[PDB]
Design a protein around this motif. Structure first.
Motif, PDB file in Angstrom:
ATOM      1  N   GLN A   1      -8.171  36.100 -22.051  1.00  0.00           N
ATOM      2  CA  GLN A   1      -8.927  34.852 -22.104  1.00  0.00           C
ATOM      3  C   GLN A   1      -9.825  34.685 -20.874  1.00  0.00           C
ATOM      4  O   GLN A   1      -9.616  35.292 -19.822  1.00  0.00           O
TER       5      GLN A   1
ATOM      6  N   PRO B   1       1.434  30.598 -26.086  1.00  0.00           N
ATOM      7  CA  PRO B   1       0.061  30.224 -26.456  1.00  0.00           C
ATOM      8  C   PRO B   1       0.015  29.203 -27.583  1.00  0.00           C
ATOM      9  O   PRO B   1       0.768  29.283 -28.557  1.00  0.00           O
ATOM     10  N   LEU B   2      -0.897  28.237 -27.445  1.00  0.00           N
ATOM     11  CA  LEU B   2      -1.157  27.307 -28.538  1.00  0.00           C
ATOM     12  C   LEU B   2      -1.896  28.014 -29.670  1.00  0.00           C
ATOM     13  O   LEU B   2      -2.630  28.985 -29.462  1.00  0.00           O
TER      14      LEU B   2
ATOM     15  N   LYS C   1      -7.860  28.177 -32.161  1.00  0.00           N
ATOM     16  CA  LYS C   1      -8.831  29.222 -31.864  1.00  0.00           C
ATOM     17  C   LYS C   1      -9.670  28.909 -30.628  1.00  0.00           C
ATOM     18  O   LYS C   1     -10.462  29.755 -30.198  1.00  0.00           O
ATOM     19  N   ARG C   2      -9.509  27.727 -30.046  1.00  0.00           N
ATOM     20  CA  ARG C   2     -10.278  27.331 -28.879  1.00  0.00           C
ATOM     21  C   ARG C   2      -9.542  27.700 -27.597  1.00  0.00           C
ATOM     22  O   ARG C   2      -8.332  27.951 -27.596  1.00  0.00           O
ATOM     23  N   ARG C   3     -10.295  27.720 -26.495  1.00  0.00           N
ATOM     24  CA  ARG C   3      -9.699  27.736 -25.162  1.00  0.00           C
ATOM     25  C   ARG C   3      -8.707  26.593 -25.016  1.00  0.00           C
ATOM     26  O   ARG C   3      -8.872  25.522 -25.606  1.00  0.00           O
TER      27      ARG C   3
ATOM     28  N   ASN D   1      -1.584  31.634 -22.075  1.00  0.00           N
ATOM     29  CA  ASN D   1      -2.955  31.933 -22.481  1.00  0.00           C
ATOM     30  C   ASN D   1      -3.936  30.808 -22.126  1.00  0.00           C
ATOM     31  O   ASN D   1      -4.935  30.620 -22.818  1.00  0.00           O
TER      32      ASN D   1
ATOM     33  N   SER E   1      -6.896  28.649 -20.053  1.00  0.00           N
ATOM     34  CA  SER E   1      -8.136  28.922 -19.341  1.00  0.00           C
ATOM     35  C   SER E   1      -8.323  28.046 -18.115  1.00  0.00           C
ATOM     36  O   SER E   1      -9.287  28.260 -17.368  1.00  0.00           O
TER      37      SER E   1
HETATM   38  C1  LIG Z   1      -5.968  33.074 -26.169  1.00  0.00           C
HETATM   39  O1  LIG Z   1      -6.961  32.096 -26.094  1.00  0.00           O
HETATM   40  C2  LIG Z   1      -8.241  32.558 -26.546  1.00  0.00           C
HETATM   41  C3  LIG Z   1      -9.226  31.454 -26.235  1.00  0.00           C
HETATM   42  O2  LIG Z   1      -9.378  31.293 -24.827  1.00  0.00           O
HETATM   43  C4  LIG Z   1      -8.168  32.923 -28.029  1.00  0.00           C
HETATM   44  O3  LIG Z   1      -9.437  33.471 -28.374  1.00  0.00           O
HETATM   45  C5  LIG Z   1      -9.883  33.212 -29.720  1.00  0.00           C
HETATM   46  O4  LIG Z   1      -9.514  34.283 -30.557  1.00  0.00           O
HETATM   47  C6  LIG Z   1      -9.864  34.093 -31.934  1.00  0.00           C
HETATM   48  C7  LIG Z   1      -9.322  35.291 -32.681  1.00  0.00           C
HETATM   49  O5  LIG Z   1      -8.045  35.009 -33.235  1.00  0.00           O
HETATM   50  C8  LIG Z   1     -11.374  33.942 -32.085  1.00  0.00           C
HETATM   51  O6  LIG Z   1     -11.607  33.481 -33.412  1.00  0.00           O
HETATM   52  C9  LIG Z   1     -12.603  34.243 -34.124  1.00  0.00           C
HETATM   53  O7  LIG Z   1     -13.920  33.770 -33.877  1.00  0.00           O
HETATM   54  C10 LIG Z   1     -14.956  34.457 -34.633  1.00  0.00           C
HETATM   55  C11 LIG Z   1     -16.311  33.887 -34.231  1.00  0.00           C
HETATM   56  O8  LIG Z   1     -16.301  33.618 -32.833  1.00  0.00           O
HETATM   57  C12 LIG Z   1     -14.671  34.302 -36.147  1.00  0.00           C
HETATM   58  O9  LIG Z   1     -15.638  35.020 -36.898  1.00  0.00           O
HETATM   59  C13 LIG Z   1     -13.271  34.824 -36.465  1.00  0.00           C
HETATM   60  O10 LIG Z   1     -12.994  34.701 -37.873  1.00  0.00           O
HETATM   61  C14 LIG Z   1     -12.237  34.105 -35.604  1.00  0.00           C
HETATM   62  O11 LIG Z   1     -12.276  32.726 -35.978  1.00  0.00           O
HETATM   63  C15 LIG Z   1     -11.940  32.902 -31.126  1.00  0.00           C
HETATM   64  O12 LIG Z   1     -13.355  33.051 -31.077  1.00  0.00           O
HETATM   65  C16 LIG Z   1     -11.399  33.072 -29.707  1.00  0.00           C
HETATM   66  N1  LIG Z   1     -11.816  31.952 -28.879  1.00  0.00           N
HETATM   67  C17 LIG Z   1     -12.500  32.104 -27.743  1.00  0.00           C
HETATM   68  C18 LIG Z   1     -12.864  30.842 -27.024  1.00  0.00           C
HETATM   69  O13 LIG Z   1     -12.803  33.211 -27.309  1.00  0.00           O
HETATM   70  C19 LIG Z   1      -7.060  33.950 -28.248  1.00  0.00           C
HETATM   71  O14 LIG Z   1      -6.863  34.177 -29.640  1.00  0.00           O
HETATM   72  C20 LIG Z   1      -5.748  33.468 -27.625  1.00  0.00           C
HETATM   73  N2  LIG Z   1      -4.713  34.484 -27.730  1.00  0.00           N
HETATM   74  C21 LIG Z   1      -3.552  34.268 -28.354  1.00  0.00           C
HETATM   75  C22 LIG Z   1      -2.574  35.412 -28.345  1.00  0.00           C
HETATM   76  O15 LIG Z   1      -3.302  33.204 -28.910  1.00  0.00           O
END
Ligand SMILES: *[C@@H]1O[C@H](CO)[C@@H](O[C@@H]2O[C@H](CO)[C@@H](O[C@@H]3O[C@H](CO)[C@@H](O)[C@H](O)[C@@H]3O)[C@H](O)[C@H]2NC(C)=O)[C@H](O)[C@H]1NC(C)=O
Ligand SMILES: *[C@@H]1O[C@H](CO)[C@@H](O[C@@H]2O[C@H](CO)[C@@H](O[C@@H]3O[C@H](CO[C@H]4O[C@H](CO)[C@@H](O)[C@H](O)[C@@H]4O)[C@@H](O)[C@H](O[C@H]4O[C@H](CO)[C@@H](O)[C@H](O)[C@@H]4O)[C@@H]3O)[C@H](O)[C@H]2NC(C)=O)[C@H](O)[C@H]1NC(C)=O
Ligand SMILES: *[C@@H]1O[C@H](CO)[C@@H](O[C@@H]2O[C@H](CO)[C@@H](O[C@@H]3O[C@H](CO[C@H]4O[C@H](CO)[C@@H](O)[C@H](O[C@H]5O[C@H](CO)[C@@H](O)[C@H](O)[C@@H]5O)[C@@H]4O)[C@@H](O)[C@H](O)[C@@H]3O)[C@H](O)[C@H]2NC(C)=O)[C@H](O)[C@H]1NC(C)=O
Ligand SMILES: CO[C@H]1[C@H](O)[C@@H](O)[C@@H](O[C@H]2[C@H](O[C@@H]3CO[C@@H](O)[C@H](O)[C@H]3O)OC[C@@H](O)[C@@H]2O)O[C@@H]1C(=O)O
Ligand SMILES: *[C@@H]1O[C@H](CO)[C@@H](O[C@@H]2O[C@H](CO)[C@@H](O)[C@H](O)[C@H]2NC(C)=O)[C@H](O)[C@H]1NC(C)=O
Ligand SMILES: *[C@@H]1O[C@H](CO)[C@@H](O[C@@H]2O[C@H](CO)[C@@H](O)[C@H](O)[C@H]2NC(C)=O)[C@H](O)[C@H]1NC(C)=O
Length: 456
Positions: A16, A269-270, A273-275, A317, A319
């Motif tokens: 992240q 982790p929450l 999909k956001r920070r 996780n 930010s």
């Molecule tokens: C830890 O936190 C971060 C955020 O700080 C999480 O990142 C997020 O990861 C997801 C993937 O599961 C991303 O979603 C994807 O976005 C794209 C378009 O941007 C979309 O096409 C996909 O279908 C999916 O929705 C998301 O963008 C991303 N968020 C950021 C701010 O980067 C991460 O998943 C977390 N890790 C855990 C283990 O929870």
């Protein structure tokens, strides 16, 4: 070669992003920094440097301010820009801007002067006349939210407009707000400013506020919901993720999901999909532990908070990590820095925060870091400018000899500098260590935190 403890950092395994570190000065505690209880001009500037100067102090990068709900500034209340009801939701509101906001406006100016990027404005409650209980205190609900009607009408849009106006006063006075929240601990029913909402009730308002900001052409990052604990905030996320008949969820409008550490700690982790941000946490026990980094695992010890921070990033996780009060005229652990009239005592909790904040700068990315032994826990971040910051907590009773491998980089690291926090050290810079083939050896003291900072 013999290796007591092996630490491996992998800049190609990336997680992240980081927005930063900081604290609040709500409930008039900002006024403490500006001499309310006798702090000299010298120490006013000293405290502001400790908090916000990257060179002279911690370089905190997030300030969480309260959007006051009160109609006076007695006791420790934060007064509102709309203290008195306009009569009805559609009546023209009368707003008052005092260029002060319980000391938080001049504080924000001083933090920004030292480089602080992020100002997070957060309401504990709507003004009382907007709520089912006609009271900023003792929870209650925003009039018009699902399930909560009021005889005076539907105040949802009025509250959204009110929050927009608070943000406008700040921007027009030269201090733009970057993040905006409208709840604090909605689970909690307390004697001070408070206001309820479950996940779907919060979602309802998120969409109203986000659509209002779009109409007004205001770019700001929306948050929810500053839950009283991590699990309690997680429980609201399904409601925030319901895609309504318009094809949108509240999560579509949100930039950051926020929670506190009191009822349950950020250790997982929450599911958004956001920070996520840890936005408030401290030791509320009433103990007074200014000098102890480790003694017996007390809730106010420096190592306790070094570990809270490291765990929040590595295992939860997050930010960002925002403490409760930064500096206050008290002799408890509620704040990071105790003021005793004209006296400044930064705790080891402050110095643990400073170790992270001084070297893990906004937009850094967490990268993989592993340790071969459970007595040594590690975290690592690569900054925008290439500086790598590695935090090592040695909970052994003896010094630990580490072999730290940085893996593949696209330009060999040649020097690294340790900065140590312990019972004996606040944030003490040690001699530089030469790096050979992206590996270096370093000894860290017993019961300590060390930040290793590479040179570019
Ligand atoms: C830890 O936190 C971060 C955020 O700080 C999480 O990142 C997020 O990861 C997801 C993937 O599961 C991303 O979603 C994807 O976005 C794209 C378009 O941007 C979309 O096409 C996909 O279908 C999916 O929705 C998301 O963008 C991303 N968020 C950021 C701010 O980067 C991460 O998943 C977390 N890790 C855990 C283990 O929870
Ligand atoms: C590094 O390694 C050390 C061991 O070498 C670990 O130290 C232990 O840390 C735990 C906490 O993780 C300590 O347990 C906590 O102690 C607190 C302080 O207790 C002191 O003050 C009380 C006053 O009541 C005295 O009775 C006591 O003798 C101590 O002098 C307590 O306040 C804590 O209680 C809180 O949490 C518990 C558990 O959730 C609740 O039940 C309580 O009601 C309260 O909420 C807790 O008991 C323990 O004392 C430490 N042991 C030693 C030998 O020092 C570190 O945890 C470890 N650090 C890391 C980061 O891994
Ligand atoms: C601004 O804030 C500072 C920081 O709080 C204020 O300075 C402190 O003032 C209090 C009293 O108001 C002093 O508290 C006394 O401390 C005595 C023991 O002090 C020794 O031990 C300290 C522990 O590390 C040490 O910091 C201190 O060194 C300082 O003072 C020495 C003597 O003048 C000097 O040689 C050093 O270079 C250094 O400046 C002592 O070795 C204790 O016996 C008393 O009962 C009382 O508790 C603090 O010592 C002061 N700390 C410092 C660093 O000055 C300051 O007054 C505030 N206002 C202004 C205008 O500066
Ligand atoms: C030294 O005074 C501190 C109080 O001991 C401490 O309880 C706290 O009191 C504040 C209170 O802060 C809440 C602490 O719990 C969180 O879950 C919540 O989000 C906070 O709002 O906030 C209301 C205010 O009336 C109390 O004074 O902080 C005091 C302090 O100044 O540090
Ligand atoms: C100013 O704010 C106070 C505090 O919220 C309001 O007083 C509360 O009013 C409700 C509704 O009548 C009562 O249930 C509470 O007991 C009151 N609290 C206290 C501490 O008195 C007050 O009504 C507000 N005044 C105006 C003009 O809006
Ligand atoms: C501001 O801080 C001072 C210093 O800690 C407080 O004054 C002390 O209060 C304790 C009791 O809480 C007494 O034991 C000390 O003797 C007091 N010292 C002095 C010099 O008065 C003061 O109460 C604090 N004020 C507020 C509003 O927090």
């Amino acid at each position: 070669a013999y290796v007591e403890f092996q630490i491996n950092v992998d800049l190609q395994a990336r997680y992240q992003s980081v927005d930063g570190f900081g604290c609040s000065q709500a409930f008039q505690r900002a006024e403490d920094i500006f001499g309310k209880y006798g702090l000299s001009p010298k120490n006013q500037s000293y405290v502001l440097d400790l908090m916000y100067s990257e060179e002279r102090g911690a370089g905190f990068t997030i300030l969480r301010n309260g959007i006051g709900s009160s109609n006076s500034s007695t006791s420790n209340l934060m007064n509102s820009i709309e203290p008195f009801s306009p009569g009805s939701p559609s009546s023209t509101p009368n707003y008052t801007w005092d260029h002060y906001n319980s000391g938080q406006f001049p504080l924000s100016q001083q933090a920004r002067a030292r480089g602080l990027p992020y100002i997070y404005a957060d309401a504990w409650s709507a003004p009382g006349y907007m709520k089912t209980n006609q009271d900023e205190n003792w929870s209650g609900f925003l009039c018009g939210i699902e399930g909560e009607t009021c005889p005076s009408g539907d105040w949802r849009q009025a509250y959204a407009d009110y929050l927009v106006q608070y943000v406008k006063f700040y921007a027009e006075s030269g201090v733009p707000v970057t993040h905006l929240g409208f709840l604090n601990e909605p689970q909690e029913v307390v004697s001070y400013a408070s206001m309820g909402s479950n996940g779907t009730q919060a979602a309802e308002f998120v969409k109203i506020l986000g659509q209002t900001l779009e109409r007004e052409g205001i770019d700001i990052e929306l948050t929810c919901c500053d839950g009283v604990g991590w699990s309690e905030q997680e429980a609201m996320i399904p409601g925030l993720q319901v895609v309504g008949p318009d094809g949108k969820s509240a999560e579509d409008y949100l930039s950051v999901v926020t929670g506190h550490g009191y009822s349950s700690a950020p250790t997982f982790p929450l599911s958004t999909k956001r920070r996520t941000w840890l936005t408030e946490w401290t030791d509320l026990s009433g103990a007074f532990t200014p000098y102890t980094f480790f003694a017996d695992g007390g809730a106010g010890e420096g190592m306790t908070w070094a570990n809270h921070i490291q765990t929040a990033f590595v295992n939860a996780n997050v930010s960002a990590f925002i403490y409760w009060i930064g500096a206050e005229n008290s002799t408890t652990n509620s704040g990071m820095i105790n003021l005793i009239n004209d006296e400044v005592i930064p705790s080891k909790r402050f110095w643990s925060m400073a170790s992270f904040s001084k070297f893990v700068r906004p937009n850094a990315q967490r990268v993989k870091a592993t340790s071969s032994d459970a007595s040594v826990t590690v975290s690592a971040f690569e900054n925008t400018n290439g500086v790598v910051a590695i935090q090592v907590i040695n909970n052994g009773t003896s010094a630990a000899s580490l072999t730290i491998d940085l893996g593949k980089t696209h330009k060999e690291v040649k020097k690294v500098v340790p900065w140590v926090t312990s019972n004996d050290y606040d944030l003490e810079e040690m001699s530089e260590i030469d790096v050979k083939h992206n590996s270096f050896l370093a000894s860290v003291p017993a019961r300590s935190l060390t930040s290793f900072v590479t040179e570019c």
